[PDB]
């Protein structure tokens, strides 16, 4: 039978809820498909990630990469990211240099803005490059900014944006930010790789809640006359009371006689219930 088909839509609604909870989002983001098209970058790191498809925390999702587009001369980047400068494995600014019509050498300079001083006002220098371009192809350039980004986390208000210059030998400006109707995914962005963010209900036996929760249960092997088990004598196993059952368990180590003139020490998986949570 297909009792299941009726339940099927409500399982999908449950997984939706669980996904939002694991990603730490109170609601699903409202982003139009048009805006996605504008913002999704058409660049190597994203083609790599997309093309791949064809008190410790084990519940919540772990961030490997963060891609930040500029907050609305351009390129300030905004971070509610929490510190973790040591954990920031890599930081790269990606910029797309538009096609040229003659073979030309392109000089790129990326400047960190600083608080104005009398001498050497407002620019510090992060990377300067020179590249040779041929017609018909534009190219994506990846600039290391790990030490810069770390200073920004270490001291906010030291992040006053960046300036990007790209030009040919004779000074002509070859803009890097694309506002055209056709031009999607070609803006700058920051790729940061991070290793960080390592990070139910339990009740009394007599407590009244019928919300499914964890209940204590102590297993005493000496009480059963299972004297062959040398260690642990006792342990907390616990239990739970579209099904309320254990979502996380832990193992225990046990030293016991097997009754063949051998004592064994082993790790027994899924002996203790840690969390119950409906499933």
């Amino acid at each position: 039978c297909t009792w299941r088909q009726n339940t099927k839509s409500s399982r999908i609604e449950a997984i939706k809820i669980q996904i939002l909870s694991k990603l730490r989002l109170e609601t699903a983001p409202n982003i139009s498909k048009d805006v996605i098209r504008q913002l999704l970058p058409k660049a190597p790191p994203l083609r790599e990630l997309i093309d791949q498809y064809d008190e410790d925390d084990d519940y919540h999702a772990t961030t490997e990469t963060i891609i930040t587009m500029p907050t609305e001369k351009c390129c300030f980047f905004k971070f509610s990211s929490k510190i973790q400068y040591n954990k920031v494995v890599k930081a790269q600014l990606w910029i797309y240099l538009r096609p040229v019509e003659t073979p030309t050498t392109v000089f790129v300079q990326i400047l960190r803005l600083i608080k104005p001083m009398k001498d050497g006002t407002r620019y510090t220098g992060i990377r300067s490059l020179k590249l040779d371009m041929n017609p018909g192809t534009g190219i994506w350039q990846s600039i290391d900014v790990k030490t810069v980004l770390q200073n920004w986390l270490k001291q906010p208000e030291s992040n006053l944006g960046i300036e990007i210059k790209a030009l040919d030998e004779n000074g002509h400006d070859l803009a890097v930010t694309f506002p055209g109707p056709g031009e999607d995914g070609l803006n700058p962005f920051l790729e940061v790789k991070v290793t960080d963010t390592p990070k139910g209900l339990d009740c009394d036996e007599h407590s009244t809640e019928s919300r499914c929760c964890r209940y204590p249960l102590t297993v005493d092997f000496e009480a059963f006359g299972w004297d062959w088990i040398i260690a642990p004598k006792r342990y907390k196993a616990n239990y739970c009371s579209p099904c309320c059952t254990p979502t996380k368990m832990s193992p225990i180590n046990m030293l016991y006689f097997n009754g063949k003139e051998q004592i064994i020490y082993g790790k027994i998986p899924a002996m203790v219930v840690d969390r119950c949570g409906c499933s």
Partner: antibody
Amino acid sequence: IQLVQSGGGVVQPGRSLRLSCAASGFTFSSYGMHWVRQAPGKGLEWVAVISYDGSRKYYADSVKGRFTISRDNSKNTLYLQMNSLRAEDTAVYYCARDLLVRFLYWSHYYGMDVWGQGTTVTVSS
Amino acid sequence: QPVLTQPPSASGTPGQRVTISCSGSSSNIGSNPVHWYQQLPGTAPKLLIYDDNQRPSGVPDRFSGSKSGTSASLVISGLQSDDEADYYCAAWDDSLNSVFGGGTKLTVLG
């Protein structure tokens, strides 16, 4: 893309010499320009740099006050004027161009990818 | 005149990986981009590395370089015997002068 040097020679101390470096292949006035030298079997020593248009000039302390850098962007030519020559000025003199153009900041900080063939000057009393 | 310090000498076996070192001051290397040159006997120098770790066109990726604090490193993997030459580091000092190191003779052991 080339820097072709001229001048040089033997000369007595206290006398003077002028080196030339003629550039072709690129827009000469888009770049800072340097002179560097090397005494017989020793290291490289930077002697001076000049801006794109000639308005800033910096010199190594060892030649400060006796050597002068200059350029004539109309003849695509870099000059070094050497006066009060001493024996420790004897070396091969190389002209070199900045890898980055002057439309970037700190262009002369970053290095020099062009380089002429070198010109020998030998100063002995 | 505030100079950069490089070991006088270095050697490797063909195919081995050598490392040339450069110690400076905060006035130069510490704040400013480092460039490296190769010089064959009686030719002009040739820039191998700029902005610490970047190669100009025509320079193999076996040549790499890095910068930590007041020091820099040029490392030649895959050591061929054409690599036999003098190697110089360089950077701009804040006293308004470009500064070379003393040069490192690199021997490719035959």
